[PDB]
Write a protein that binds this ligand. Structure first.
Ligand SMILES: c1nc(N2CC[C@@H](n3cncn3)C2)c2cc[nH]c2n1
Length: 165
């Protein structure tokens, strides 16, 4: 099970960790990917998860897109978790660097409520351009299921914990 997490609320937990290493250790039922609408896993969390699957996540994702078309910003899809988890919940947060509306971040976190427990990154943070402090606030105010947040960057983790409330 999940270990070394700081408890933020009744249902939200956080740890300074690489979500790939966390997924490989815990083998959670669900790992969340910080996806884009095309499921093109090039960088950030998506590029790291995909590389850990030896590109099997991208091969599966290209078949999904060929059949279904792109996701909506704020939407999600459930695909295989490969060697990392039972399932991967690909969630698209708004990318502020591409000009998407930050109000879609709450819709993105609502996808987590369809799963009892999840290992996840902060949505729209990193290369997506949003303020991670805002992202954690939206996560805590939107997700009601048990979410274990892995924050890769130690300096950001400390800033998030010391400013939480
Ligand atoms: C958790 N979060 C991650 N990320 C969050 C936004 C993004 N980033 C940008 N600066 C700091 N981190 C990537 C990653 C990347 C690999 N493994 C991870 N585990």
């Amino acid at each position: 099970s999940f270990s070394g997490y700081l408890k933020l609320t009744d249902n939200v937990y956080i740890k300074n960790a690489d979500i790939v290493e966390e997924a490989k250790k815990v083998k959670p039922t669900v790992v969340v990917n910080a996806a884009n609408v095309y499921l093109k896993h090039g960088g950030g969390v998506a590029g790291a998860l995909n590389k850990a699957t030896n590109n099997a996540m991208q091969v599966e994702s290209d078949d999904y897109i060929a059949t279904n078309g792109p996701l909506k910003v704020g939407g999600s899809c459930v695909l295989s978790g490969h060697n990392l988890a039972k399932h991967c919940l690909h969630v698209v947060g708004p990318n502020v660097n591409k000009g998407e509306d930050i109000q879609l971040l709450k819709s993105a976190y609502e996808n987590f409520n369809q799963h009892e427990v999840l290992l996840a990154p902060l949505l729209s943070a990193g290369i997506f351009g949003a303020d991670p402090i805002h992202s954690l606030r939206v996560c805590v105010d939107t997700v009601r299921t048990n979410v274990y947040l892995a924050v890769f960057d130690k300096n950001l983790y400390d800033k998030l914990v010391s400013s939480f409330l």
